[PDB]
Amino acid sequence: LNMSDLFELCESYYNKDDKASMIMSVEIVAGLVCGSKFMSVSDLDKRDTFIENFLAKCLDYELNHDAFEIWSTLAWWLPAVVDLRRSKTFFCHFINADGMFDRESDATHQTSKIYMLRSILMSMEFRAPDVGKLFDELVFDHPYDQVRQAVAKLLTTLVQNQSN
Amino acid sequence: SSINGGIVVAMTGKDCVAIACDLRLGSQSLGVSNKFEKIFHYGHVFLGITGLATDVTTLNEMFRYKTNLYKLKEERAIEPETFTQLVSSSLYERRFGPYFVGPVVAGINSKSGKPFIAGFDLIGCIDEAKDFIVSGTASDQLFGMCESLYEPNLEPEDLFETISQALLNAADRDALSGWGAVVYIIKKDEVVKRYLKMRQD
Amino acid sequence: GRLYQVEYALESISHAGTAIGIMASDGIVLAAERKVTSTLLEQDTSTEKLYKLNDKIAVAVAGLTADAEILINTARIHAQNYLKTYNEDIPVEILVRRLSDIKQGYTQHGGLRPFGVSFIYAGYDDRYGYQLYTSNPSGNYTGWKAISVGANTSAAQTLLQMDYKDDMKVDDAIELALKTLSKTTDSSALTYDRLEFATIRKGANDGEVYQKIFKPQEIKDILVKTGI
Amino acid sequence: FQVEYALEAVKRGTCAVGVKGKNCVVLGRRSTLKLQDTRITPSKVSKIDSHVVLSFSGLNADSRILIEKARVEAQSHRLTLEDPVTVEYLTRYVAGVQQRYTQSGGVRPFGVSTLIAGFDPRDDEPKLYQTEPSGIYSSWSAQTIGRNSKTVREFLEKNYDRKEPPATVEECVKLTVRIEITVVKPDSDIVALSSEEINQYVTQIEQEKQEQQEQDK
Amino acid sequence: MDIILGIRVQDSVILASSKAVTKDSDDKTRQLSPHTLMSFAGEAGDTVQFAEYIQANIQLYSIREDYELSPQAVSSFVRQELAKSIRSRRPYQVNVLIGGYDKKKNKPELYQIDYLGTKVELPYGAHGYSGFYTFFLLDHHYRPDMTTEEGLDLLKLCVQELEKRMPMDFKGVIVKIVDKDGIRQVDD
Amino acid sequence: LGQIDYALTAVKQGVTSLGIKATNGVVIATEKKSSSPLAMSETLSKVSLLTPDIGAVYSGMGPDYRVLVDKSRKVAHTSYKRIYGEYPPTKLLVSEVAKIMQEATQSGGVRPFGVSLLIAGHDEFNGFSLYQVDPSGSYFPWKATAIGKGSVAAKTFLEKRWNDELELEDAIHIALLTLKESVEGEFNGDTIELAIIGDENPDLLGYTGIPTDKGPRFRKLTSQEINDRLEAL
Amino acid sequence: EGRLFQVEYSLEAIKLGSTAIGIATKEGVVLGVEKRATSPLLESDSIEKIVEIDRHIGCAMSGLTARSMIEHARTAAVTHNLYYDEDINVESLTQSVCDLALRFMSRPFGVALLIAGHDADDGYQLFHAEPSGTFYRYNAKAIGSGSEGAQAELLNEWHSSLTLKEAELLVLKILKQVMEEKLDENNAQLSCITKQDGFKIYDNEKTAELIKELKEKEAA
């Protein structure tokens, strides 16, 4: 196999209608991330590019609340089994998401991104990358209750991760 | 009763039965319908009802209800004798409140294979005869015709002619009947329904 | 607000026999598996799990027998009442909703145990054609194309999802039901004496003979032809 | 407790949204399985009569009884007073039935909430009411009952304003659900939208969002 | 007394009702279904009570099922109600004609139900003595393939004959037509 | 465990009784227990006629069976007869008895009956039949069965003995052997109660003159006949 | 020993709900209730804790609106008018409500009510009816949250020479004290019972004007 059949299978299985297909696609993504210990440098670069493209395509436009559960479970589970430093593009998408803390935006998507980032941070509290820039990006005047709750929970997680 | 008219006659032949009825429905002298059939069948048993048309329809619906429930519960079609007993019991259940009807039951028993005809009074008294049963506003003419014409052990071809002639001649002398006649010839496995051409219609 | 009695009834049904109903473009097929054996128990108990409510509607049962008999008698009485009132055959959905309402009423008033019975209805009427329904103790009824109840519900549902088409024929549905049952029973092989079969189909002539309940010899012949 | 558990059972039901406008009322399905027939499906929005419609949230089997009782009561009122039932009378009747069922022990009275919408006969004033267990019924201009509830209510509060209700019906229908829509209009008018119309509304929302992102991002 | 007449033509049902109550603008009709109308005659307000009861039941059925009843089922229901009524205290003295268009079979149908509960479903029917003065014309100038206009002309002839040859003044007639589009009223 | 299981235990503690269906009849047999020579055994009957063609035997609490026999006899006339003019088939009567027992189980303030019934019968279009009715209210058809105390060994023997070509005499012989293998005390004609559903007996009708009216098919064996049969074991 | 403590537990309605205060004067009876703060888009007109029994009798409540007592009171008043061609006495209606509670005593039924009315025998009357099937005549009475402080204020303020306007001002002041300020026109509801006008409920404009007058009086 030319290492690209997995990409095609993951792309084909990600259908926003059938939840089982999306679960299979996320399982393929998790296998790609966890399999980053037998590969070569070129294979790692190709995997990073594919992961960046897939995360940009699947988690930037709209979530139908069925993919959100799967992605939140993946964000909870993946850092606890493998190190996210093996991939240069996975954690980057979540940490550098744009419009995540925007005040005058619209809401639900921002809350989903905040919750995914908070799950990633909780899965590794003290062995986490320096993310102190969030302390400047946090907004306490968002007029949405869900965003306010998400911001408070993320602040609690950030405070806990610095108290070791 | 005796305000809508109508006559039914049943006869027993050789391994077969015949049941014929008129088709007139009216309100006293005025004629209303010439297609009001008075013969129904459930499973393989036939019932003709004379008298008040509303009671005829009500009894037909109730007996269809009971026969369908009987088939569902017992997984078997009802026989003419059991149906006769059921009709008699249902009629007697309305003592002092009777249905103004005259019922006649005909059919061939599936197991034994012998013909069976019977008649009922106002309150469900069973009258079982081996030759013929008559009912309706022209029962006297029907009795005379049957006594004069009937013979035992008739073939279906001759039985049809006999019952048709009796019914037509009895209806021609009755003012409240004779707007068309229908005859059923019933055998072990085949039933033939025929419409008759007659005067005044 | 969970209902513990309904959950207990569902769990009890999950240990009962498996019934399969498949709807085709020209007919409906119902199959059921017999599980009770004693080498001396008579197998001529009319039809153990398949029942006729009228000339147009049939039902397959999974659960306790007495509650099933009570509900079937009530459904027959309701169908006959509708026929007497309107001089027309009762639509399938009306009878299904009546039985579902009875179950819901039995799951709300105290002192009454919920009906631990699951029903698969197969009917035909001139408003929707062929109809297939499933009703549970909770009182909810759902329409389906291919449904299964009883023991191996999940495996049978997966097998049906794998090999179901929207334009199957009656014989195709029969073969699919037989193969699905043969691959889910815990008795190694499927035999005629452990199977009940029924079909509801309309021919070219508008006779609507919706009462074909297969005889044991016919079941054996169908199994031999299919290759189970 | 009995009312609290019934409310918890309500919270597990499918989301339902009711909005009222200038001269119309808009009433707002899970993922069907691959072997499920959708040709014969009981719509989540049931019309009690030609001018009053009902939308439930919670247990469906328990809601069927309430819908049947409401229809029977409406027909009885029509036969007894020659006048079709009003919205408030029907809401009060449903609330009274629920309150009566809450008492006498009440292991589970109904475990379902309802939204009753429509117009009073010979009148053109939209009426929207929300009924909950314990017999409590209230009036609303934009209400939501179901899984989210709080998020949808906050969205309605920040979007729907109690100073200029939407004059046209298209804007009332054009509501983001993050789907079944029923429109009630005076002179006893009820219209249930089709799949194509709702898909067109969804595509319009998506195109508007794309345009807004293109302008600013 | 009161004249109620009905004619079933190849694609329609025409119902004619007297407008006199012993008022001249009396409508002795109730729309049971968008494709089924019923005319009633006989005694006092018992007729209105029976018609309203039947209409309420049929409307409840239509609301529950979201599917209107066929004319045959409606006629059977009315016949059952009348048959139950006659066998109990306070019977209804109501004679009815039911005209309805079956959409499933695309065909007009007319039913005549007596106060006792007798149903016939004639091609053309009347209640009261109006049958005496009209049934000859209907026996001479009726075809199973007639159009709506021919049926209206035949009904006009029957109404003129009733006016000429009946001692009772029934103060005109009101005419309804039932067809595929529903129920309309003739304003002539 | 509930009241139904306790009633089943009470049934298991009762006297055995049996039932064997052959091609041309049904045989019911049981043992009468009376550990008191002063008491008269003839005054007590364990096999009761329900209809001229349907009989019953029981295992469990005697008074419950005595009441249930009267209830079944009344329901055989009230429900089916006096309507169709004939006795009900075995299946419908068994269904009515099961309905009575089910109503007893479900009714509040009433304990379930502590008996299990073996009902034998014959009817047209169905031939001969044998059924078992449990205290719960569920009935099951059987080819050959036993209940009571020594029911396990009796069932094993019946399984080893029953076949498809068995006749009425062979069924009687097998029932007698099964009773002999588990008789609690004294095995003679006065302690054995046996009945057969078989051919119609015109000599028990009581009158002559109606060719269609046939005699009952239920026949209860006397002590002398049972002793004569035991002499052949 | 043993005693009926369920009745006493029911009578502990200090936390039953919103405060309701009634003041009876020689010119009318004023009933004031607390309006809950709900969603802005909610139609607050659907909240009615002050109900009309008939033209000369009104009622106020502190607990949940969900009903039978109000319907029974209306039916009793209509029945008395039909049977005697006159208006039923306020005390007679209160006794009818108490008898309804008693018949439908070791268990409480219903909730507490404040019944205000007028008749030619006893002038203007205010009664407190409890779910124990009993009642008490009162010269001003407060129920609901903060009922003890409100009742102490009523004891200190009521002096039998009040007028309707002064009664309304006292009701508003006590409601503001119980609810701790910020009561313009949407946290309170006022109603009056007078011989001429019967039973009336003040509209929002009149309540706002009364609040403005109360603020002006406080400023002095």
Side-chain angles (χ1 to χ4, degrees), chain C residues 82 87-88 97 126-127, chain E residues 61 65 70 72 80 104:
Chain C
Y82 191 99
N87 202 258
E88 293 179 353
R97 184 172 61 255
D126 50 359
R127 177 181 175 181
Chain E
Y61 187 102
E65 295 297 332
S70 62
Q72 194 273 346
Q80 182 196 34
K104 185 171 301 178

Side-chain angles (χ1 to χ4, degrees), chain G residues 53-54 72-83 86 88 93:
Chain G
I53 303 303
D54 82 314
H72 171 81
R74 292 170 168 174
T75 302
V78 172
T79 306
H80 183 88
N81 182 265
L82 177 62
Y83 286 174
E86 58 177 345
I88 187 179
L93 182 84

Side-chain angles (χ1 to χ4, degrees), chain C residues 1 101 104 107-108 139 145, chain D residues 12 35 40 62 64-65 108-109:
Chain C
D101 291 359
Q104 189 275 346
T107 58
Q108 187 178 9
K145 300 180 179 180
Chain D
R12 286 185 171 92
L35 298 185
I40 313 168
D62 298 1
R64 292 203 308 266
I65 275 72
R108 184 199 75 263

Side-chain angles (χ1 to χ4, degrees), chain D residues 24-168:
Chain D
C24 59
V25 206
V26 173
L27 293 180
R29 294 181 297 183
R30 294 310 184 98
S31 64
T32 64
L33 301 187
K34 301 185 299 181
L35 298 185
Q36 180 173 341
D37 170 71
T38 57
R39 277 74 185 94
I40 313 168
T41 301
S43 301
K44 284 185 170 299
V45 199
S46 300
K47 45 175 296 182
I48 308 181
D49 46 3
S50 59
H51 63 290
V52 170
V53 197
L54 177 55
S55 180
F56 79 100
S57 180
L59 297 180
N60 322 25
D62 298 1
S63 67
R64 292 203 308 266
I65 275 72
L66 290 182
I67 295 177
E68 177 72 16
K69 290 185 176 181
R71 290 169 172 172
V72 172
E73 175 61 32
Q75 291 303 138
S76 298
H77 185 283
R78 199 184 307 262
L79 189 58
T80 306
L81 293 180
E82 204 199 33
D83 292 1
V85 64
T86 67
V87 187
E88 190 174 15
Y89 187 94
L90 201 49
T91 300
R92 181 170 59 255
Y93 173 83
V94 175
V97 172
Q98 281 185 327
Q99 196 275 340
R100 193 269 300 267
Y101 268 81
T102 49
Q103 315 305 291
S104 302
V107 181
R108 184 199 75 263
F110 279 101
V112 61
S113 298
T114 49
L115 305 175
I116 303 184
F119 291 82
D120 291 334
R122 208 165 301 180
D123 195 2
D124 49 73
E125 176 184 352
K127 257 67 181 300
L128 174 64
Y129 287 85
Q130 170 259 3
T131 313
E132 62 180 358
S134 294
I136 307 298
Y137 69 95
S138 180
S139 180
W140 300 87
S141 57
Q143 180 59 20
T144 304
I145 297 179
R147 295 291 186 92
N148 300 14
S149 299
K150 290 187 176 181
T151 303
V152 192
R153 277 191 292 270
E154 185 177 13
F155 180 87
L156 293 176
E157 291 165 12
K158 299 191 60 182
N159 293 268
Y160 181 83
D161 47 74
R162 289 281 286 98
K163 203 65 177 183
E164 37 104 18
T168 57

Side-chain angles (χ1 to χ4, degrees), chain G residues 33-36 44 172 182-190 202-212 215:
Chain G
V33 81
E34 156 186 342
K35 278 291 187 59
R36 307 300 185 89
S44 58
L172 292 176
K182 200 54 184 178
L183 180 130
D184 41 64
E185 62 274 346
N186 301 123
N187 301 332
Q189 190 180 29
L190 290 183
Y202 295 168
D203 49 348
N204 295 330
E205 286 72 18
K206 190 174 182 179
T207 304
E209 181 175 352
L210 289 175
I211 263 73
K212 170 185 295 299
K215 284 184 172 58

Side-chain angles (χ1 to χ4, degrees), chain F residues 173-205:
Chain F
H173 183 80
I174 295 179
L176 288 180
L177 291 176
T178 309
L179 282 189
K180 188 175 184 178
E181 276 296 332
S182 67
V183 48
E184 302 186 16
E186 210 66 24
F187 188 76
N188 65 89
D190 294 330
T191 59
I192 303 167
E193 195 164 356
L194 200 155
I196 49 102
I197 306 289
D199 289 76
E200 297 158 337
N201 308 120
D203 61 329
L204 295 178
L205 185 60

Side-chain angles (χ1 to χ4, degrees), chain F residues 209-229:
Chain F
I210 307 177
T212 59
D213 287 356
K214 298 294 182 178
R217 293 184 171 268
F218 179 90
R219 191 174 67 90
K220 188 190 194 67
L221 302 190
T222 61
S223 300
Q224 181 61 33
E225 298 173 345
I226 296 178
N227 287 326
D228 294 331
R229 293 188 180 276

